[PDB]
């Protein structure tokens, strides 16, 4: 009886404005809203559907006790249809239950261990919620987890190659957990694709978030940060001065094995590195970052070989496999060939005398390709300054910044 009256109220209220009262009723609940609604939802919204469908789905997913009978899959399909027929800017007026619905859907998918069906949902869910493509929403950390638990990295690339510029307030909620999870899962995704120059940046952004207490997610963002910095660079980069003081007082003593690993990877000695890896294998295997330390061990040899090029112009292979400790001229030859194939080094192998000759003549700065690169850097800097000016102009006109 009352359900029909509420449905008619939402039907007559919508499509004629009066948005404030509308969102006022959506969150008025109604003590489970007579959960047997179900079927009439189909006639509640057609074509452009309506906004009450979001509330119906949210209250259906909010019980968290075997939500929608063993036929839940069918409802899943309906949700997909919703994602393809939501449309409009009106959903932006209710950016509080949409995020909760997406989180509940992802949690349900995870607990059934099928994190591939919902990948496509959280692309149109994100695309139809953010004001612009440079806005961080709470669903980014959710897609970055869905595409990471199940091995599928490419779909998340378009949302990780952009630079976040503003964060949606979502009219409440949005704790720091989502921000940290997004900037940690993006870092892991970038590490998986062997793109370290941006994985380091992602981990650095994750670490320097303001905090007052020790969190479970910052530990496994400094632990991996050390390894990524040891792989990409020859040392653990110093954190910037504006880092939160919690990491420098409590986080560091908690995980000291990686600091010792860096200390060993401060003086060139592969034997000590392998010995410390063997000794502290339980710590490195309890945190599940197995494989990222073998990369450091392998990169030590490449670093030593690269350092060899700053002193020598032509080195015998037998003599070369005595300072890097590769134990064999053939292994040194294959390592040098692999390094050349990746462009890390500039060398040539002469098999007549078994000698490696270093050229170190990358490029003279007269090729028009370098002019194109300089033009690209020009465009990026100009765009950055334009965004800076646009951001500043809003501040200059702010009603708060005229009183002082």
């Amino acid at each position: 009886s009352a359900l029909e009256q509420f449905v008619n109220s939402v039907r007559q209220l919508s499509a004629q404005g009066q948005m404030t009262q509308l969102c006022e009723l959506i969150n008025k609940s109604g003590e489970l809203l007579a959960k047997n609604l179900s079927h009439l939802d189909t006639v509640l919204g057609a074509l452009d559907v309506q906004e009450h469908s979001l509330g119906v789905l949210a209250v259906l997913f909010v019980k968290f006790s075997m939500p929608s009978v063993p036929d839940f899959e069918t409802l899943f399909s309906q949700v997909q249809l919703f994602i393809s027929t939501c449309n409009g800017e009106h959903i932006r007026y209710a950016t509080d239950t949409f995020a909760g619905l997406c989180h509940q859907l992802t949690n349900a998918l995870v607990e059934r261990k099928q994190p591939l069906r919902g990948i496509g949902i959280l692309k149109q869910a994100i695309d139809k919620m953010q004001m612009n493509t440079n806005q961080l929403t709470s669903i980014h950390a959710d897609l970055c987890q869905l595409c990471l638990l199940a091995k599928c990295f490419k779909p998340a690339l378009p949302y990780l190659d952009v630079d976040m510029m503003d964060i949606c307030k979502e009219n409440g909620a949005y704790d720091a957990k989502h921000f940290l999870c997004y900037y940690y899962y993006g870092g892991m995704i970038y590490t998986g694709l062997k793109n370290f120059e941006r994985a380091l940046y992602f981990y650095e952004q994750a670490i320097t978030t303001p905090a007052m207490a020790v969190s479970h997610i910052m530990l496994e963002s400094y632990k991996k940060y050390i390894l990524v910095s040891l792989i990409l660079l020859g040392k653990v980069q110093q954190l910037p001065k504006y880092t939160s003081q919690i990491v420098g007082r409590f986080i560091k003593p908690l995980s000291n094995a990686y600091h010792e690993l860096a200390q060993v990877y401060s003086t060139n000695n592969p034997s000590e590195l392998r010995n410390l890896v063997n000794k502290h294998s339980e710590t490195f295997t309890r945190d599940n970052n197995m494989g990222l330390v073998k990369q450091c061990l392998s990169s030590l040899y490449k670093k030593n070989i690269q350092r060899l090029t700053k002193t020598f112009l032509t080195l015998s292979l037998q003599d070369m496999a005595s300072r890097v400790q590769l134990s064999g001229p053939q292994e040194a030859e294959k390592y040098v060939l692999h390094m050349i194939e990746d462009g890390e080094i500039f060398a040539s192998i002469n098999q007549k005398d078994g000698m490696v000759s270093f050229h170190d003549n990358p490029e003279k700065y007269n090729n028009p390709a370098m002019l194109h690169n300089i033009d690209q850097e020009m465009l990026k800097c100009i765009e950055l300054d334009e965004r800076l000016k646009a951001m500043d102009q809003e501040i200059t006109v702010n009603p708060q910044f005229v009183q002082k």
Partner: protein, 57 residues
Amino acid sequence: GLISARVDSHSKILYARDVDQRSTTFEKSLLMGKEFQRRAKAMMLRAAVLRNQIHVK
């Protein structure tokens, strides 16, 4: 970093090394530009996150 030279073990000869000033100038300028862009984007993200009162309570 006291002697700018390179050792050739095939003939056992120490050659002098001449630095190309233009190339190192261009490389240093490009590296500085990339570093500045990275720092600018980092601080802008910081300003985005320090305005919404994100402090990990």
